[PDB]
Design an enzyme around this catalytic site. Structure first.
Site, PDB file in Angstrom:
ATOM      1  CB  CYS A   1       8.127   0.821  -2.783  1.00 51.19           C
ATOM      2  SG  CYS A   1       8.239   0.841  -0.988  1.00 51.19           S
TER       3      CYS A   1
ATOM      4  CG  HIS B   1       5.890   4.751  -1.689  1.00 46.86           C
ATOM      5  ND1 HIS B   1       5.809   3.443  -2.117  1.00 46.86           N
ATOM      6  CD2 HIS B   1       6.135   5.496  -2.794  1.00 46.86           C
ATOM      7  CE1 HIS B   1       6.014   3.403  -3.426  1.00 46.86           C
ATOM      8  NE2 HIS B   1       6.201   4.643  -3.862  1.00 46.86           N
TER       9      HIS B   1
ATOM     10  CG  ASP C   1       4.725   6.811  -6.368  1.00 45.06           C
ATOM     11  OD1 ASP C   1       5.041   5.620  -6.180  1.00 45.06           O
ATOM     12  OD2 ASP C   1       3.778   7.380  -5.770  1.00 45.06           O
TER      13      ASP C   1
END
Ligand SMILES: [Ca+2]
Length: 210
Positions: free
Chosen positions: A42, A155, A173
């Site tokens: 991520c 995250h 995202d």
């Protein structure tokens, strides 16, 4: 999506972007938006969107040559980047906030790492809303998803905009197969960042990049 979040994939969420006065970052980020290879990646997905958007020194590899572009596959071609933390390690466990800082810095850009424990919500909100109005300045946030009502662990993703009327930030995202971009109340995002990452034993937070 938990009721505290406004999905960008809705009429309300599009309107929050159209009524936002701090949304300059949205345009270049939208042009570079990518899907994380996996959860551990991520941060890599997040860095390369920002690095492509800054137009820096891009890697020159076989995949896209003669073109230079940051990609998740080529991000560790940079010898300095590899030295920060092994590609193999990041592929399994992701990266911490400090590591995210160091990995971005290794491509010669200016980075300011802000642990939540070293700031507060008022300063976060204010400094980030300013940043989101400026070109050539990006913000990446590191947060615990479950604190914003999402599924689970830590995250990393860039911010694209701030909506003054609702006091919500737009998170681009990189888990695109899982979630849409989301408009999150600053107070939810603050609580999510003000969490101790067990890997670093330090608080999460946000990084400025220019
Ligand atoms: Ca900016």
């Amino acid at each position: 999506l938990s009721p505290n979040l406004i999905g960008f994939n809705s009429n309300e969420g599009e309107k929050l972007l159209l009524t936002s006065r701090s949304r300059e970052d949205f345009f270049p980020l939208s042009m570079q938006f990518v899907t994380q290879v996996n959860q551990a990646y991520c941060g890599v997905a997040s860095i390369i969107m920002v690095l492509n958007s800054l137009g820096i020194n891009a890697p020159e590899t076989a995949q896209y040559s003669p073109y230079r572009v940051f990609t998740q596959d080529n991000f560790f071609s940079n010898e300095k980047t590899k030295a920060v933390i092994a590609p193999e390690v990041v592929a399994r466990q992701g990266m911490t906030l400090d590591e995210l800082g160091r990995l971005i810095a290794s491509y010669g850009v200016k980075v300011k790492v802000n642990h939540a424990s070293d700031t507060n919500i008022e300063d976060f909100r204010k400094q980030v809303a300013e940043n989101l109005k400026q070109d050539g300045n990006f913000v990446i946030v590191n947060y615990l998803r479950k604190e914003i009502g999402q599924e689970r662990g830590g995250h990393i993703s860039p911010l694209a905009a701030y909506n003054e009327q609702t006091d919500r930030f737009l998170i681009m995202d990189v888990s695109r197969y899982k979630y849409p971009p989301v408009w999150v109340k600053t107070t939810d995002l603050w609580k999510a960042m003000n969490t101790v990452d067990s890997v670093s034993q330090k608080t999460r937070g946000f990084v400025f990049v220019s």
